[PDB]
Design an enzyme around this catalytic site. Structure first.
Site, PDB file in Angstrom:
ATOM      1  N   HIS A 117       0.827  -1.204   0.000  1.00 37.88           N
ATOM      2  CA  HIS A 117       0.000   0.000   0.000  1.00 37.88           C
ATOM      3  C   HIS A 117       0.864   1.258   0.000  1.00 37.88           C
ATOM      4  O   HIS A 117       0.656   2.161  -0.818  1.00 37.88           O
ATOM      5  CB  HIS A 117      -0.955  -0.026   1.200  1.00 37.88           C
ATOM      6  CG  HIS A 117      -1.799   1.204   1.341  1.00 37.88           C
ATOM      7  ND1 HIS A 117      -3.156   1.211   1.093  1.00 37.88           N
ATOM      8  CD2 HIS A 117      -1.485   2.463   1.728  1.00 37.88           C
ATOM      9  CE1 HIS A 117      -3.635   2.424   1.305  1.00 37.88           C
ATOM     10  NE2 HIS A 117      -2.639   3.204   1.682  1.00 37.88           N
ATOM     11  N   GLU A 118       1.844   1.341   0.910  1.00 31.92           N
ATOM     12  CA  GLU A 118       2.655   2.555   0.983  1.00 31.92           C
ATOM     13  C   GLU A 118       3.510   2.729  -0.271  1.00 31.92           C
ATOM     14  O   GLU A 118       3.669   3.846  -0.777  1.00 31.92           O
ATOM     15  CB  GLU A 118       3.569   2.554   2.210  1.00 31.92           C
ATOM     16  CG  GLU A 118       2.920   2.298   3.553  1.00 31.92           C
ATOM     17  CD  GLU A 118       1.627   3.024   3.767  1.00 31.92           C
ATOM     18  OE1 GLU A 118       0.821   2.488   4.554  1.00 31.92           O
ATOM     19  OE2 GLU A 118       1.395   4.098   3.165  1.00 31.92           O
ATOM     20  N   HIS A 121       1.561   4.216  -3.076  1.00 30.75           N
ATOM     21  CA  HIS A 121       1.473   5.671  -3.021  1.00 30.75           C
ATOM     22  C   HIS A 121       2.683   6.315  -3.694  1.00 30.75           C
ATOM     23  O   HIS A 121       2.552   7.324  -4.397  1.00 30.75           O
ATOM     24  CB  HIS A 121       1.434   6.151  -1.565  1.00 30.75           C
ATOM     25  CG  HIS A 121       0.110   6.002  -0.878  1.00 30.75           C
ATOM     26  ND1 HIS A 121      -1.096   6.310  -1.473  1.00 30.75           N
ATOM     27  CD2 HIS A 121      -0.184   5.615   0.386  1.00 30.75           C
ATOM     28  CE1 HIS A 121      -2.075   6.096  -0.612  1.00 30.75           C
ATOM     29  NE2 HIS A 121      -1.548   5.684   0.528  1.00 30.75           N
ATOM     30  N   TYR A 153     -13.621   5.585   3.372  1.00 33.46           N
ATOM     31  CA  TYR A 153     -12.219   5.962   3.268  1.00 33.46           C
ATOM     32  C   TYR A 153     -11.725   5.624   1.868  1.00 33.46           C
ATOM     33  O   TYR A 153     -11.467   6.525   1.063  1.00 33.46           O
ATOM     34  CB  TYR A 153     -11.407   5.253   4.354  1.00 33.46           C
ATOM     35  CG  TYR A 153      -9.944   5.648   4.384  1.00 33.46           C
ATOM     36  CD1 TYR A 153      -9.541   6.839   4.964  1.00 33.46           C
ATOM     37  CD2 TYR A 153      -8.966   4.824   3.841  1.00 33.46           C
ATOM     38  CE1 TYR A 153      -8.214   7.205   4.989  1.00 33.46           C
ATOM     39  CE2 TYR A 153      -7.634   5.182   3.868  1.00 33.46           C
ATOM     40  CZ  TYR A 153      -7.264   6.368   4.444  1.00 33.46           C
ATOM     41  OH  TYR A 153      -5.929   6.702   4.466  1.00 33.46           O
ATOM     42  N   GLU A 160      -6.172   6.561  -2.072  1.00 35.82           N
ATOM     43  CA  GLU A 160      -6.169   5.387  -1.209  1.00 35.82           C
ATOM     44  C   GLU A 160      -6.741   4.177  -1.934  1.00 35.82           C
ATOM     45  O   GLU A 160      -6.218   3.068  -1.793  1.00 35.82           O
ATOM     46  CB  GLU A 160      -6.931   5.670   0.088  1.00 35.82           C
ATOM     47  CG  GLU A 160      -6.438   6.881   0.868  1.00 35.82           C
ATOM     48  CD  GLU A 160      -5.009   6.757   1.383  1.00 35.82           C
ATOM     49  OE1 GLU A 160      -4.451   5.638   1.435  1.00 35.82           O
ATOM     50  OE2 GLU A 160      -4.443   7.811   1.734  1.00 35.82           O
TER      51      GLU A 160
HETATM   52 ZN   LIG Z   1      -2.595   5.207   2.289  1.00 33.70          ZN
END
Ligand SMILES: [Zn+2]
Length: 195
Positions: A117-118, A121, A153, A160
């Site tokens: 996930h990071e 980004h 979210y 995201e």
């Molecule tokens: Zn995130």
């Protein structure tokens, strides 16, 4: 990925991942690198070209000097939880920093996998020129952005949803199949991006 592609990507990651000074589980840090090695090599080589470092951490994010500015700051979507960035195990965007041991969903974060996930980004922002803000992705997000859950979210923040979809695509065959079933347009978009 086949074992030889994984090894090639791990070699690339040796010049992206930075290990911490403090004490940590070396086997688990290696497992995190192994999971990152499933990311398509073109993205990894582009991160290396931009000198992006994936900093694995032996402690809290805000105990690293470069993230002391986040001490006490509430992440977007975490208002009212009593939690701050001190409690958040990973960050991604213009940099990447990840607490070793906190990969799995629920280890202080909601992603299917922290490091993917990071790093997604960072790939979004550094490599793909904020593709999560692109008109093409906005159309896909409007249709499929709630279909991985966390509707208030992921379904609200396209950056995201992009990062989470990318993580599903690259973590393992199960999540990759789940993404194809739940978010077919997102899946095809990611598949084509790596072509
Ligand atoms: Zn995130």
């Amino acid at each position: 990925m086949d074992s030889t592609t994984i090894q090639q990507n791990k070699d690339t990651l040796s010049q992206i991942v930075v290990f911490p000074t403090g004490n940590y589980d070396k086997n688990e840090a290696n497992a995190m690198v192994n999971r990152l090695a499933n990311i398509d090599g073109k993205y990894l080589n582009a991160l290396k070209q931009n000198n992006l470092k994936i900093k694995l951490l032996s402690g809290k994010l805000t105990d690293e000097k470069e993230y002391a500015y986040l001490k006490g700051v509430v992440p977007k979507g975490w208002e009212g939880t009593g939690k701050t960035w001190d409690d958040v195990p990973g960050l991604g965007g213009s940099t990447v920093a990840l607490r070793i041991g906190f990969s799995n969903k629920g280890k202080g974060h909601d992603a299917i996998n922290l490091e993917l996930h990071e790093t997604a980004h960072a790939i979004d922002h550094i490599v793909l020129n904020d593709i999560s803000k692109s008109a093409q992705f906005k159309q896909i997000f409007a249709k499929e952005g709630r279909s991985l859950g966390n509707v208030n979210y992921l379904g609200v923040y396209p950056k995201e949803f992009f990062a989470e979809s990318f993580a599903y695509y690259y973590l393992n065959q199960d999540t990759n199949s789940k993404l194809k079933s739940a978010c077919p347009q997102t899946y095809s978009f990611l598949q084509n991006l790596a072509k």
